[PDB]
Design an enzyme around this catalytic site. Structure first.
Site, PDB file in Angstrom:
ATOM      1  N   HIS A 132      -3.554   5.305   4.283  1.00  0.00           N
ATOM      2  CA  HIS A 132      -4.245   4.068   3.949  1.00  0.00           C
ATOM      3  C   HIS A 132      -3.480   2.849   4.449  1.00  0.00           C
ATOM      4  O   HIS A 132      -4.068   1.937   5.041  1.00  0.00           O
ATOM      5  CB  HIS A 132      -4.444   3.998   2.439  1.00  0.00           C
ATOM      6  CG  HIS A 132      -5.547   3.088   2.014  1.00  0.00           C
ATOM      7  ND1 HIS A 132      -5.366   2.084   1.089  1.00  0.00           N
ATOM      8  CD2 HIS A 132      -6.847   3.030   2.382  1.00  0.00           C
ATOM      9  CE1 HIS A 132      -6.506   1.445   0.906  1.00  0.00           C
ATOM     10  NE2 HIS A 132      -7.422   1.998   1.680  1.00  0.00           N
ATOM     11  N   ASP A 168       0.858  -1.175   0.000  1.00  0.00           N
ATOM     12  CA  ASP A 168       0.000   0.000   0.000  1.00  0.00           C
ATOM     13  C   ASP A 168       0.897   1.229   0.000  1.00  0.00           C
ATOM     14  O   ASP A 168       2.072   1.155  -0.371  1.00  0.00           O
ATOM     15  CB  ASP A 168      -0.965   0.002   1.197  1.00  0.00           C
ATOM     16  CG  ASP A 168      -2.053  -1.041   1.083  1.00  0.00           C
ATOM     17  OD1 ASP A 168      -2.265  -1.589  -0.017  1.00  0.00           O
ATOM     18  OD2 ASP A 168      -2.719  -1.302   2.106  1.00  0.00           O
ATOM     19  N   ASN A 217     -13.806  -0.436  -5.553  1.00  0.00           N
ATOM     20  CA  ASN A 217     -14.819   0.461  -5.008  1.00  0.00           C
ATOM     21  C   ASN A 217     -15.633   1.030  -6.161  1.00  0.00           C
ATOM     22  O   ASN A 217     -15.342   2.115  -6.664  1.00  0.00           O
ATOM     23  CB  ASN A 217     -14.171   1.557  -4.197  1.00  0.00           C
ATOM     24  CG  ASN A 217     -13.793   1.103  -2.812  1.00  0.00           C
ATOM     25  OD1 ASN A 217     -14.457   0.254  -2.229  1.00  0.00           O
ATOM     26  ND2 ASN A 217     -12.715   1.659  -2.282  1.00  0.00           N
TER      27      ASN A 217
END
Lengths: 517, 517, 406
Positions: B73, B29, B163
């Site tokens: 994140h 990430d 998403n």
């Protein structure tokens, strides 16, 4: 649009929240002016397609077009279906798609209409509206086959019955399709105050070669005001009143959109059966019920259709023809009752037929569990020794716990149907100067066919041609312009009469637009 | 993190001693703040790598970075996976490795993500977590190929589904890999009290060109509180609540770590099959089971997965497409049941499919000896004459001595799948001033492709371009800025709509972020 | 909810079912009647009340119109001029519409019945109370069916119905006339006779329907079935009778049935249309076997059009639009002509609300703009509405109780 929509029950559906939101309606007509303030917000980003010009601008034909005249039919139809604003359409929340398949003047090739139908199926349209149509009573026309291809790709197809005077066997080509809601036109109750009445220009069934009852349903189609383009740069949008069977179909298209919003799981055939089941029979001025091939099943009632837990299919059935010279002939049909409710119900059947020598029977009662399906076997028996030849109309009535859930119009024909033996005739100039070509349409062939010539004063000049044992369909004959054999016509303007005799009945048709010698 | 972990069964596994000790989890990430007191002791000596900066300090992006914005994140994901302290992660004993592949702003090159995956495989990571991803529904993207390279080098790979709103065919690129656990997001039961429900931003399958069911599993991913950096020198560490499919995957990564501690001999595919087999199906508010390409197999249950002596693989199967116009088409699959127990067992198979015209059969019972493997031959048969086109969901249920050991979601598609014909479109300035380049993505090509231009008021200005017979993938078109041919646009702000028609269905997509003339 | 209750009672293995509810729609195909006919075929005896309506034919309730269910009327026990058993004057009376079936099926004591009640008092919640109604005649027959099912464990629900209906004592009124069949059914139950019965005649009562022929003779026939439950071959003797002139009845005058077998008797009725006055006629088939009488089957036929109420119920509610009204009426067989008339609070004829022709049977709804005789608006006040329906040569009327307000 301010009186017909309350009549069919549009406002009552609106107050229930059912306005057609999410349903997509395609309008295959001369194109739609998608800038009328009443239509602006009902059109999505992609407005449709223009097949007569091959561009993505389905605007109506402008004024001053070399190929024809300006058009406003499609915009009026679209306003009738779904217009939000000063005029409220039947389903004033449905998305619209415009498909310009009819060129300037309102005329369009069959291939363009088929392309429009297929592209509307591509674009995900849930309801389809066809206010076009020729006047060939053939259930297997190309536009009818295309319309039966849809209604099987999950797209409800509503079409006009056609604009022909009060006369049986005059239903148009796309409106002869086996699986499509064909709509006739009615007059709203006007003040001796009259009730609803069918207009005298709606085409009437039955369909040839299938004897199907048409129109399927009737709807208000006389003096309908809706959005039009004025074709004036000073103010391009306005309202206009048009009349025709082509404007009864948009009411049923809006009704189908509303129902599809209300019942999202219904198939196109289930919607057709629900509209056709819950319809009010219409009586004429004297007090006689209009014939089935003038009414179909009556006027739509959107509110009754939306609240229906039992569906009887097919909504109307035709037993065909009974040709036996002697003896008794028996036919039977299986109607299907779907019990959409959560409770086991008992349905009661009443079969009736007009005319003597016809005995009707079958399952007098069924019990159907919840969310299931039952079959009722209606049976008709014709005694050839007692029945006069003709077309007889029957009815299967289904009752369930008080209210009537359906009234299925049935029909049978005894001996040979009384269709027009010859439908259309025209005369054009032949490939060779001085000769002519006669093109005629024979719905079922002709044992004998005769072409006769009349002068401008409609005086019988003589006999153009005689023919025997002609095949059905389109027939072409070369005519050397000479009458009674070897007698040449004087120069002038002439009419031609086609007289066709087949299977014990004869019909005739005269050429309008006289040809010139 | 204090309510989702009890729900999936983390605490119950902890009281059995299974907390993920010895298992190494990599977090690819935006980087991890490996100084949060809840994360300090879970990081070993070597913390990871920073590919966007090429140093051994995988810290998050600080506040005030010229290249982008500060990020949090990765720290949130790492706290969800394994945080020991005030907040307890799913596996609060696993070693962590941080791999900063997403630069400031959360954007990262595909090559950096591939490098991160390969370096995580180098560093001996047993579980891998990817909460990144683009929105290209392609199973053969570079990040998906890299993820399939792992899961074969003995490294379990858990990735977010993406998403995107409630819509089929919207699963992201790394989450389309054939061998990787893709996770969708669910809402915990909240008070009319509701049960677990899928969030409406989880991407939904199927995958293009493979028709695989995705997400593979769902997990709690709405309103998850976990460790974040506050990016404040006064107090740099805190807790924050984030939501997204990218935060459902860390739960499954922690679950995989716990299982790998519990079952040290299981392969990555065996872990995927164990998570997918023992999963609770989710029903929506009305009471209908969520579709398979919205649920995958249900929510994880770590406790059931840890105590499982029978594994059915693959956990979900897709029969592909049935394209025959007429006749019957038969396909078959071989599922494999591994009997991990010490006792010979008898497994019982129940095959079901929704929709008419689909008949399912196969091995109704197998007997598998201890520590062995059996094969069940499921078989599906589609009658092309009776089946409506569409996507149908089936299920293979395996029972063994009372309890159900698996519920394998199956899926088949009839005729052409209803994927978006065009997925994305953008317009940039061309190499020549005054011209533009249009880049679009066509998942399976386009029979016809049209670019239309709209003004800032979303009024149809005209038709930019028309193209035919386009190849699938990324397509680039040069546009001279002129509309309908030779008509130049006025200066202003414009949107472009791509309309692609292919194989009997059409789709459209509008450019957000309007381009300027 | 009632359908769900019936189905759940069938689920739970109930052998006998009791329905003391019911509306007042004389329709054999109501939802509750269809549900009751679904049972009695899933091996569950169904006993229902006939309904609570004054002495008047064609007033039997909805669940008590089912084709296969024991419908019970209410009787008064012999009380001291000492009287014998007598039917109460609130029991609904048949026949059923559209099937012309004789109802009630059986009568039972249903006047002044004392039984357990809740007092709805926390101090003492349980007590005893005396209630009256047709809804309390059915529990006696439900208990009788339970007792019989214990005694005869092999009998089907229809066999129990035939055994209760066969062995029943006919009731005479005060003057000495037998109560009509659609006031009695078959008489009062006698559990002891029903329990000791080796011959069953089914159906326990039959209805020949209607005879509509204008001229000539019309013949109908029915096949009754006699089951010889005994171990000995028996000979059954049939006596057919009908009241009224022009009706001739005949058929099998004797059958011989072997042990544990079944015989069929073909009763036949013939109506001479030229001699018979229109009306409802009651007959009887009596079966004798070796002394004792084993059954007395009530039969019934109707000549020309039945004299049912042409309109059953009417109510007026406020319409969806303020100032307008909706009239809901029930027409058992449609109406050739239907008229709505308005009366003031003093029951003085104010005028004519609406006129309609050729109405379909069932529930009919009419929108009324509140204006009388056409374009004449009513003054504010309280009003009644009368529905007058004329159909097939007879007319009926019904007045709205609970007056509506203008």
């Amino acid at each position: 649009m301010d009186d017909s929509a309350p009549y069919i029950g549009a406002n009552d559906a609106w107050k229930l929240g059912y306005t057609g939101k999410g349903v997509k309606v395609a309008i295959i007509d001369t194109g739609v002016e998608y800038k009328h303030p009443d239509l602006k917000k009902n059109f999505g980003q992609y407005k449709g397609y223009d097949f007569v010009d091959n561009d993505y601008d389905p605007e109506e034909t402008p004024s001053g077009d070399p190929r024809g005249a300006s058009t406003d039919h499609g915009t009026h139809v679209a306003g009738t279906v779904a217009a939000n604003g000063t005029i409220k359409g039947v389903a004033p929340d449905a998305t619209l798609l415009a498909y310009r398949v009819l060129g300037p003047g309102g005329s369009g090739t069959t291939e363009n209409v088929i392309a429009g139908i297929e592209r509307a199926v591509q674009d995900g349209a849930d309801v389809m509206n066809l206010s076009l149509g020729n006047s060939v009573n053939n259930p297997d026309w190309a536009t009818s086959t295309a319309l039966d291809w849809a209604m099987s790709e999950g797209v409800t197809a509503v079409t006009s019955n056609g604009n022909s005077g009060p006369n049986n066997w005059t239903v148009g080509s796309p409106g002869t399709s086996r699986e499509a809601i064909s709509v006739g036109a009615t007059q709203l109750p006007l003040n001796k105050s009259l009730t609803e009445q069918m207009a005298d220009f709606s085409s009437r069934g039955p369909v040839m070669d299938t004897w199907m009852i048409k129109p399927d349903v009737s709807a208000p189609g006389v003096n309908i005001v809706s959005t039009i383009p004025t074709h004036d740069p000073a103010d391009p949008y306005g309202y206009g009143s048009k009349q025709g069977t082509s404007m009864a179909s948009p009411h049923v298209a809006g009704a189908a959109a509303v129902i599809k919003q209300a019942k999202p799981k219904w198939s196109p055939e289930q919607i057709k059966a629900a509209l056709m089941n819950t319809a009010e029979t219409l009586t004429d001025a004297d007090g006689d019920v209009y014939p089935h091939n003038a009414q179909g099943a009556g006027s739509i009632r959107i509110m009754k259709a939306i609240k229906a837990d039992s569906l009887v299919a097919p909504g109307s059935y035709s037993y065909g023809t009974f040709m036996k010279d002697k003896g008794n002939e028996t036919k039977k049909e299986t109607f299907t009752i779907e019990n959409q409710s959560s409770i086991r119900k008992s349905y009661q059947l009443e079969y009736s037929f007009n005319g003597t020598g016809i005995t009707v029977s079958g399952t007098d009662r069924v019990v159907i569990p919840a969310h299931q399906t039952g079959k009722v076997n209606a049976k008709v028996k014709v005694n050839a020794k007692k029945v006069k030849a003709g077309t007889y109309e029957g009815t299967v009535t289904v009752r369930e716990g008080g209210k009537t859930v359906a009234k299925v119009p049935t029909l049978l024909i005894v001996k040979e149907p009384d269709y027009p033996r010859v439908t259309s005739i025209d005369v054009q100039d032949g490939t060779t100067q001085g000769t002519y070509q006669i093109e005629t349409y024979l719905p079922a062939g002709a044992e004998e066919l005769a072409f006769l010539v009349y002068d401008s004063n409609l005086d019988f000049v003589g006999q153009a041609g005689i023919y025997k044992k002609q095949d059905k369909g389109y027939q072409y004959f070369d005519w050397n312009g000479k009458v009674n054999g070897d007698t040449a016509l004087p120069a002038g303007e002439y009419y031609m009469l086609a007289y066709a005799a087949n299977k014990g009945k004869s019909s005739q048709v005269l050429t309008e637009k006289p040809f010139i010698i």
